[PDB]
């Protein structure tokens, strides 16, 4: 759809869309940029993630509202609540499938540096996790396993190639811990992962500049917030 627009113009318009809080547009611009076939820079990977995370985040919030109404209804309200929850769910699945398709064609396979590869495998884990949040059919177990496998490959690379304070490594651990707690029914694994991540980052803060320290400690506090919620 964006095939006739220059890559650089798509990137510029994605930045404008973010400033205007037009995240659906932002995602469409970034999909067009990825489809140009060139690798993405660090900044461009963040535009891609911000756009889709905000789109799917709104769908998730709406799905949860509708799913709560539907569960309470189960006086006869008719088929409408279930139909509308299904509509939002199908839309959400479609966005996740689109993101997974960009990662598979061909972002992950060309990503050789640890920072890019970990970033994309973390995203893959996240969008399978969002599919798992709404899954109930014969493929639920396979969707959960696909998230697990992507996060695990990202973790293995991150532990070999990045310091324990690296923000991508920290955010990956944060999200994989949420996977364990909320999806995999493994709260102890979630707590263990968050605490070991936090403690190993703490012990490496001394190596960091003021700005890197600020970034790492911000994510450490997110880990701590979850640990406080879970314990």
């Amino acid at each position: 759809a964006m095939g006739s627009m220059e890559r650089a113009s798509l990137i510029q318009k994605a930045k404008l869309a973010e400033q205007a809080e037009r995240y659906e547009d932002m995602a469409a611009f970034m999909k067009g940029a990825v489809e140009k076939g060139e690798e993405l820079s660090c900044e461009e990977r963040n535009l891609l993630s911000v756009a889709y995370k905000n789109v799917v985040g709104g769908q998730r919030a709406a799905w949860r509202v509708l799913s709560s109404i539907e569960q309470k209804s189960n006086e006869e309200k008719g088929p409408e609540v279930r139909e509308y929850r299904e509509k939002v769910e199908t839309e959400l699945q479609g966005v996740c499938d689109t993101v997974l398709g960009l990662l598979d064609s061909h972002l992950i396979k060309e990503a050789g540096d640890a920072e890019s590869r970990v970033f994309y495998l973390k995203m893959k884990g996240d969008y399978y996790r969002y599919l798992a949040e709404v899954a109930t059919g014969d493929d639920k177990k396979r969707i959960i396993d696909s998230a697990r496998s992507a996060y695990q490959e990202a973790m293995d690379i991150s532990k070999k190639e990045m310091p324990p304070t690296n923000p991508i490594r920290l955010g990956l651990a944060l999200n994989f811990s949420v996977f364990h707690y909320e999806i995999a029914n493994s709260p102890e694994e979630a707590i263990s992962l968050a605490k070991t991540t936090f403690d190993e980052a703490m012990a490496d803060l001394h190596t960091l500049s003021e700005d890197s320290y600020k970034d790492s400690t911000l994510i450490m506090q997110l880990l701590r917030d979850n640990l406080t919620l879970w314990t």
Partner: peptide, 9 residues
């Protein structure tokens, strides 16, 4: 529980 945000804020 919270996952990573898209931006620092």
């Amino acid at each position: 529980a919270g996952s990573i945000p898209g931006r620092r804020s």
